[PDB]
Design a binder for this molecule. Structure first.
Ligand SMILES: [Mg+2]
Ligand SMILES: [Mg+2]
Ligand SMILES: [Mg+2]
Ligand SMILES: [Mg+2]
Ligand SMILES: [Mg+2]
Ligand SMILES: [Mg+2]
Ligand SMILES: [Mg+2]
Length: 224
RNA sequence: GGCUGUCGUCAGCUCGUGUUGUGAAAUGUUGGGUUAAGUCCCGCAACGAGCGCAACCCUUAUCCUUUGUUGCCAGCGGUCC
């Protein structure tokens, strides 16, 4: 990753001056047109060492999950995870899915049974009414937790989009002592994240840049 | 003990795990619509489940098939009708 490629995607952009969190005053260079400018000369070493640690953990054989739930950012997250042989969540984060795994992991078995009944020819016999409920059940259990169906246990790292919009997952992971790599704007709380990567996180270009970089480094680490 | 009346055939009453609070407790069960209904859809630090609601039970209203006595008489023969 290079500084010019970062500035080309709008990473320099931040948020307004009246919405800034003073916990990351150090990661701000200046302000123009009543908008903060992120000191990206801090961003480059952070991003590089974060990628190094991510691919090291990939070589350490630790499954990972990609967390992004924005309405205009789901496809990038799901594709970056899918073409990485890893896991993803792109809808509402079902609260407690980590700390309360014992009661959500059977929703996985329910989804699997429903999908076998779907693509096995079972949805023909019954009296043409409950198939509607079954189809909606497939739809909802696919949208909610259909991206971790083959998770098979707790993860070993988490990648987070919009630390503000995704703080419940951050607390859930912090409970379990699992490292978190998150993207933070200038209105974010960097307390729960041990590997902090500053940068704009409302533009599609920067988000897909980060996702491509992390997918590439994870494939590198698996190539070991 | 067993059995019964009533609020009231009113739509309510709880639990496991998770989270919040020093704590009694809270969330779930709140919010927008909608229904006879905690009935259903959407959103949601909650995810699921149980007793209730509804369905399964009896009878009535339409048609179909089988059997015709002690029940019936449309088409034929006789009549004490
Ligand atoms: Mg406590
Ligand atoms: Mg109640
Ligand atoms: Mg309550
Ligand atoms: Mg409430
Ligand atoms: Mg309501
Ligand atoms: Mg109910
Ligand atoms: Mg009933």
């Amino acid at each position: 990753v290079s500084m010019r490629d970062m500035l080309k995607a709008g990473v320099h952009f931040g948020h307004q001056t009246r919405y800034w969190n003073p916990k990351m005053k150090p990661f701000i260079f200046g302000a123009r047109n009543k908008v903060h400018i992120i000191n990206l000369e801090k961003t480059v070493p952070m991003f590089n060492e974060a990628l190094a640690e991510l691919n090291k953990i990939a070589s350490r054989k630790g499954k990972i999950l990609f967390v992004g739930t924005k309405r205009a950012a789901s496809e990038a997250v799901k594709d970056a995870a899918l073409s990485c042989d890893q896991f993803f969540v792109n809808h509402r984060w079902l609260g407690g899915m980590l700390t309360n795994w014992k009661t959500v992991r059977q929703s996985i078995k329910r989804l699997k049974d429903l999908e076998t009944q779907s693509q096995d020819g079972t949805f023909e016999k019954l009296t043409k009414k409950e198939a509607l409920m079954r189809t909606r059940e497939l739809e909802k259990l696919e949208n909610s937790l259909g991206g971790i169906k083959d998770m098979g246990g707790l993860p070993d790292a988490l990648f987070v989009i919009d630390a503000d919009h995704e703080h419940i997952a951050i607390k859930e992971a912090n409970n379990l002592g699992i490292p978190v790599f998150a993207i933070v704007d200038t209105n974010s709380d960097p307390d729960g994240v041990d590997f902090v990567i500053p940068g704009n996180d409302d533009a599609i270009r920067a988000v897909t840049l980060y996702l491509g970089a992390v997918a590439a480094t994870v494939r590198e680490g698996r190539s070991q």
